[PDB]
Design a protein around this ligand. Structure first.
Ligand SMILES: Cc1cc2nc3c(=O)[nH]c(=O)nc-3n(C[C@H](O)[C@H](O)[C@H](O)COP(=O)(O)OP(=O)(O)OC[C@H]3O[C@@H](n4cnc5c(N)ncnc54)[C@H](O)[C@@H]3O)c2cc1C
Ligand SMILES: Cc1cc2nc3c(=O)[nH]c(=O)nc-3n(C[C@H](O)[C@H](O)[C@H](O)COP(=O)(O)OP(=O)(O)OC[C@H]3O[C@@H](n4cnc5c(N)ncnc54)[C@H](O)[C@@H]3O)c2cc1C
Ligand SMILES: CN(C)c1nc2c(Br)c(Br)c(Br)c(Br)c2[nH]1
Ligand SMILES: CN(C)c1nc2c(Br)c(Br)c(Br)c(Br)c2[nH]1
Ligand SMILES: [Zn+2]
Ligand SMILES: [Zn+2]
Lengths: 230, 230
């Protein structure tokens, strides 16, 4: 009772399959009585580039620009750009962060990569200490809901693309785990464009139905063994 | 027949360790008599977002925007935004493409992700069919020159980050190999921020040194086994 969800959504088209997955997430979580917020990156024209614009006022060292340093200091000094801080407030308040995106080059689209780069700064998402199991967003759940062009068969250990778990590593382990998230099993909706309409509805319904019991879920063991082992 | 090299460079600060590695590449490849071009993405204010601004002509379906479909058709029609085709010309003429970047979240900075997303469109970099070993950039070489915050020890199988090769998969296999590139072994310069002055210049000289014999190298076998063992 009282769970808060942030959906970070990265697709250009409301009528897309990604749009539909985001919308049933909103519908079903709202129905449950959850607090729901959506960051529609393309609609926000979210800035992906890590630049000195991300620090307002006076730079900690305006002769040699070091993004990591400058943003760490700016966070501690409440001097980050407001597009970034707006996102951090949403994340701070959320118990669950769902990312909804089409797979671009075995990864997130650049606009969402930019969100990760700029929003998850040191002092906010991680520090020394406080990473992996002890990262600063510990307590929070994160979940990747990804759509692919490639079929499930292509994403097997012997398929052309390798196991889908292989490309999850930088996202689930290198990013989410690192910051302290417990990582819920990814939702992977394989090749909607190729699948039939029965199959497509089946995937949307799978997602809607999964959302019904999302708060009862055990998070994966976010390990090398999980991603690459047998 | 002499060689042409494109360096796609992604760092905000000319005096950075990445800047030094980039300039050493230019110096040494130039010294050899190679033709050298550098895409300095931050200096170019390179657009990372995949949006409908990337097509200028009549859309194939203006009611439901599909980025992949519209960019493929626009490539064939020659109605892609000019910043995209400017990059394509550089890649088309290159024998070797070197990517110089700091590791951001086990991956490329978003501005460089955007270059991959927007530049390597269907029809130019791959076709269906016409991918992986049949990719359209076959005959070309690619090399990732990466700098990390993490130490080499952290990037081992039993280290907290897992092996360094693990995070290369989406880039080397999912992107470069997919487009037909043969992939030269990565240059990873670990933890320059932690390093001593000597170790720093030693990492820069090691890269310069490698480049002296780059045209003698064979590519890696860009397979699951190379990346993950088993
Ligand atoms: C730059 C780029 C890089 C890419 N790299 C990769 C890669 O590395 N690997 C890979 O596998 N793929 C890759 N892709 C392909 C991409 O992942 C897929 O095209 C994308 O995931 C498809 O999702 P979508 O939301 O755009 O589908 P859509 O085309 O928008 O939807 C598919 C169909 O489902 C229909 N639909 C929508 N809503 C519903 C609903 N509620 N119920 C039933 N049907 C519905 C739509 O109308 C549509 O006809 C890449 C694509 C691009 C553009
Ligand atoms: C958003 C973000 C996400 C990140 N995610 C990760 C991650 O997932 N994993 C990870 O391991 N790291 C990560 N990092 C860390 C990042 O990879 C490192 O900070 C970066 O790789 C260091 O490279 P640099 O060029 O900025 O180093 P610099 O700070 O520019 O270089 C270090 C030192 O080298 C000196 N130097 C420059 N040129 C020379 C020279 N020619 N000779 C000697 N010394 C020289 C510089 O003056 C400086 O003092 C992340 C950083 C950011 C900002
Ligand atoms: C639009 N569409 C059907 C589409 N675009 C794709 C791109 Br770009 C890549 Br890269 C891959 Br891999 C696949 Br599969 C794609 N499918
Ligand atoms: C600036 N600096 C030294 C720095 N910034 C880092 C970031 Br951001 C991440 Br995420 C990681 Br992981 C490491 Br290691 C980093 N080291
Ligand atoms: Zn993990
Ligand atoms: Zn490969």
């Amino acid at each position: 009772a009282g769970k808060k969800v942030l959906i970070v959504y990265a697709h250009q088209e409301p009528k897309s399959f990604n749009g539909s997955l985001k919308n049933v997430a909103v519908d079903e979580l709202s129905r449950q009585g959850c607090t729901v917020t959506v960051s529609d990156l393309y609609a926000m024209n979210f800035e992906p580039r890590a630049t000195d614009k991300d620090i307002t006022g006076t730079l900690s060292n305006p002769e040699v620009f070091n993004y990591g340093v400058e943003t760490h200091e700016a966070y501690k000094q409440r001097s980050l750009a407001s597009d970034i801080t707006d996102e951090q407030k949403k994340v701070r308040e959320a118990d669950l962060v769902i990312f909804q995106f089409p797979l671009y080059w075995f990864s997130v689209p650049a606009i969402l990569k930019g969100w990760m780069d700029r929003v998850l700064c040191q002092g906010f998402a991680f520090d020394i200490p406080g990473f992996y199991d002890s990262g600063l967003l510990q307590g929070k759940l994160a979940l990747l809901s990804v759509t692919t062009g490639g079929t499930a068969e292509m994403y097997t250990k012997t398929g052309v693309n390798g196991d889908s778990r292989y490309f999850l590593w930088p996202l689930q382990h290198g990013t989410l785990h690192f910051c302290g998230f417990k990582v819920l099993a990814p939702q992977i909706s394989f090749a909607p464009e190729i699948a039939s309409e029965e199959e497509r509805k089946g995937m949307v319904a799978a997602w809607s139905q999964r959302l019904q019991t999302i708060w009862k879920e055990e998070p994966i063991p976010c390990t090398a063994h999980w991603h690459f082992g047998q």
